[PDB]
Amino acid sequence: DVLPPMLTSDQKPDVMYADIGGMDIQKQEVREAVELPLTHFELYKQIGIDPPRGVLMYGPPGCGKTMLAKAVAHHTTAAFIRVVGSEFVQKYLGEGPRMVRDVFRLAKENAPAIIFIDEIDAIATKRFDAQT
Amino acid sequence: SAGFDRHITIFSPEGRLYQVEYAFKAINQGGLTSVAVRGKDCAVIVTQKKVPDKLLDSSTVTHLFKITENIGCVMTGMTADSRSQVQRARYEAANWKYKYGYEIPVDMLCKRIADISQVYTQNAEMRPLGCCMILIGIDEEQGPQVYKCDPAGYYCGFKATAAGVKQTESTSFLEKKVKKKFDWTFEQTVETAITCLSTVLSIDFKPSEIEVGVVTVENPKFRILTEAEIDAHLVALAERD
Amino acid sequence: KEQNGDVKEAASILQELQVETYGSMEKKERVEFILEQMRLCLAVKDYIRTQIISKKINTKFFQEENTEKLKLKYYNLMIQLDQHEGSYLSICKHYRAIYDTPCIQAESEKWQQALKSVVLYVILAPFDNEQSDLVHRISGDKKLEEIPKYKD
Amino acid sequence: LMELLNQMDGFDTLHRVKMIMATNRRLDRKIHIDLPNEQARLDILKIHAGPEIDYEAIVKLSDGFNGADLRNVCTEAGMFAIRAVQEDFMKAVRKVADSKK
Amino acid sequence: LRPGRIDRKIEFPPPNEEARLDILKIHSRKMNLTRGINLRKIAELMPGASGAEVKGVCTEAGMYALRERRVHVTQEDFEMAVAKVMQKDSEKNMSIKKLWK
Amino acid sequence: MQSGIIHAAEEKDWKTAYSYFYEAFEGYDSIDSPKAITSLKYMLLCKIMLNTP
Amino acid sequence: EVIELPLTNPELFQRVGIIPPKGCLLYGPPGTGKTLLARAVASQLDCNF
Amino acid sequence: AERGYSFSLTTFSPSGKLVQIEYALAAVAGGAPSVGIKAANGVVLATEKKQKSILYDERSVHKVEPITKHIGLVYSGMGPDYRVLVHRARKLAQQYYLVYQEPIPTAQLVQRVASVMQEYTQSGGVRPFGVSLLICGWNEGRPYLFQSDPSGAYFAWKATAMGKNYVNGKTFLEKRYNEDLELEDAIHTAILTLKESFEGQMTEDNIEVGICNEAGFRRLTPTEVKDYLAAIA
Amino acid sequence: SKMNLSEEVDLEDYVARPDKISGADINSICQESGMLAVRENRYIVLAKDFEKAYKTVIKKDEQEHEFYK
Amino acid sequence: GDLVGVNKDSYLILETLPTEYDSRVKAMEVDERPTEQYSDIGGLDKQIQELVEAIVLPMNHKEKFENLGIQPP
């Protein structure tokens, strides 16, 4: 016999698009990027486009970008893995990359998914020439 | 950012002078507090006076100095730095009177002291001496004047100010008391200053644990109020409050 | 003030005490103050404030030695509030507590009025599982005196 | 601190779940404290007196923050001289003077 | 980098406008391009742009078409996509910009 | 005002339509233009259609 | 002032308290009464630590 | 980044940066908004004089100060350094006047003040001036508006903003500024540019504005600033 | 919307008052005004509560050093 | 927590066992008591006196500690 086989994307947030005032253009762009591909894919195929997977939300603090991420998580049909960029800087050698690989593998295994990385400035900065 | 911290002349990557900020922390290190308020025709400085020993001569212990015949200051911070800056202020006032033939304006003396401090903040020869000087005088064309000379070259003029540990609390109290009829008399100004100190420190003052210096338009000579006058103010104003 | 032909402002005078923060000798002076706030609020018809005050009293305290007049008055106030609000099962429960109070349970008319009120406010409540449970309980009380009208 | 998965809370969905965080240098409040007290050391010593003029005598020079002061008073008083509950008076004053900190 | 370990080293310069025309054709093959649309003009409009930039140009023009319930891409759509994708965050401060002559 | 009109017409986000109508009302009020009663009427219409009359 | 939260809930109804606060910071010097400070208040509240 | 080469002012980083002067410019950018617009027949300088309290007597320390009958100067950055630089600018103008019996040209004053800043940015025991100066003069028959940086570099500007929101100020000036702008319209443009980055109510006595026309530089009185604010609003 | 207030508490001018308050700042303002009302009983939220909360939140960005400016 | 002998298969608690101490734990005790002195440690009179109090005095003069209300750490 084979047993039916996890770590995140279970506590569906209660916020919703109606809980956010304004932010119309950002809502529209984030929707076109992360919601439309998973529901209306014929729309993208008809034009013959690969949906723009991967978006960045940059701005000053407290302007409702984590809240828009939670809103898409609420009105998400497949999965939403949430992480913080500062969580990848652990002590032991080669564990930040291991968790990046684990997060992306988890998304792939969990089929259509939306990864969210709340504060990527910690790790994803201009590569620069390392010397330590 | 802690590397940009041991030198007065190094800018932090965001453009901050941590050693100057530490000089301000040094201001907030003598434990004492000082307040200053200007009425219509008078200015008053009141300083907490700690004499934690019977052997210490209270007459010598003080933070009110007569910079010149018509200008007084209250110093808060390290005592050695306070006295050094007081001597510098007296010397600058004497030089002004010698060169230009008339008494130094209070704002001018504050600008001179602030420039002297800015020089140390820019060059790396001394440490910025960690004291705050509140100056009071009577200007013939402007009237009573109260000024500060913090140890970074900033010297804005004030309707009422405070310095030391409880400067923020005293500032809030004086803001509230000055939004309502900033026009104060001599007695009302002394009331406001003494009440500000008492309320911020959470204590009622004996006539001795407080030192008050005053200038008035009628008598524009810095006068340090005696124990009898301090007690009279406290008793009368507490009674009639 | 209330005695001098004006309660509208007398209610405001009393509705400022933070008796819960004052720290009385025990939970007697504060409870009396709270109940008088309640009474004045109901007299001026301020039911929102009355409810807020009611939430400030822990009924568990009323299960004590001298908390009998206090219990009776506090409940009567709650019945007044709920009578205005329109509820009936809460009024039933309050009248049932009044009945359970031993002082009310030591005189013919005194307990009989409480039991009639309990029966009638069981009847007047809408039919639910809890209301049916209370109907059964009052029916099984066995102290109904078999009064030929309320029993039937 | 080398721990970042222990981010702030916010899982609140239950009534009667209040917290009390304590540190130095959502929760939007604060209560400043001072280590000494103007005169409360009197009551601190009186309450810690498990076993009043001498209490005031200790308080004159007292500079402390906790009941370890009175515990040291009692032990250093009983087990040092009286053998060699009242009966200490100025001896507690002596101990608080000995307080080195 | 020593030979024998890495025998050959292939550089991948950004396309030289001819490789850019080629990439535009490659990534617009599966697309409903209107007549009179000049991928050569778009390639010229994209100097020093990488193949990823060109693919993103095609994708973003397609997204512009999608916005207006369309399956249609035009020269205006490609031009707006080029503008939106090759957006440069040049230096903000004129002082830091003018330190050097 | 045109953005509010179009938002009312197409997306059925009467909240955003009302926001734009209020901005138009404020601008036309500052200019004291006669096209401010229309903006007021449209804000009240948006309030009605939001099921909060 | 944290005892209002449990004893009643007017924070609902007319207003909203975003799940009203979960206590205050108890800013304290090296140590004065922190633990016992909270102990006595919660004992009054009848709650548990 | 190049972490080692950021504490000294007498060493090039491997890439050629002089990091400490850029940090000084960061200190400048973290200062009060100031705006300068070169009108067709004059120049205007503005800067927020918002105080940290009602107690600060906002009539004692000025931020827009004259240097000659035809030159004035505002700043963005640290006030003490500004005081030093304004004193030095006055001294340099007076030296030029004594040598040449003629008011110093604005370009020359800017050159010499930039030279002073360069002098202060060429050693290890001295901190570069943490201010940017906006000099406005009426030399010759045309107006001049210049900027001077801690690095010792000086610019000629049509219009600019410096301080906390200089990016928004410069975008606003790009939108609104036209070359053939009279001084009266330039004053309104300056005050509006300030408003776009001025928190709180822009009362007449917490903003400081100075004009420079053929009559010479002059700091507008608070009554005049109140009139301009009322007309703008 | 979820909160309930009086009829003389128009946010219609607290919006117009210039500032750089963010969405988090506005949420904090609303929460603080509600907390003010509940703490002071006064079983309504009014323009004075919003005024005090707005002042508190906007002035929170202060207490820095004044030679930097 | 108790040492009980148990049947191998059924795992049923048979007769109980009093106590077990490892050979190392039995050796974990001074057989030949050390003996040099107190005076044989110089300088730290304060530390030696404090330790003597806080260890020995509770052991021997135990009663007086609770009589005076002292907790012997």
Ligand SMILES: Nc1ncnc2c1ncn2[C@@H]1O[C@H](COP(=O)(O)OP(=O)(O)O)[C@@H](O)[C@H]1O
């Ligand atoms: N557009 C918005 N509408 C409603 N609330 C908002 C909005 N933007 C921010 N907030 C408030 O800010 C908080 C979340 O801010 P957040 O998204 O974390 O900002 P950032 O992610 O930029 O730091 C929420 O509690 C929410 O109440």
Ligand SMILES: [Mg+2]
């Ligand atoms: Mg966030």
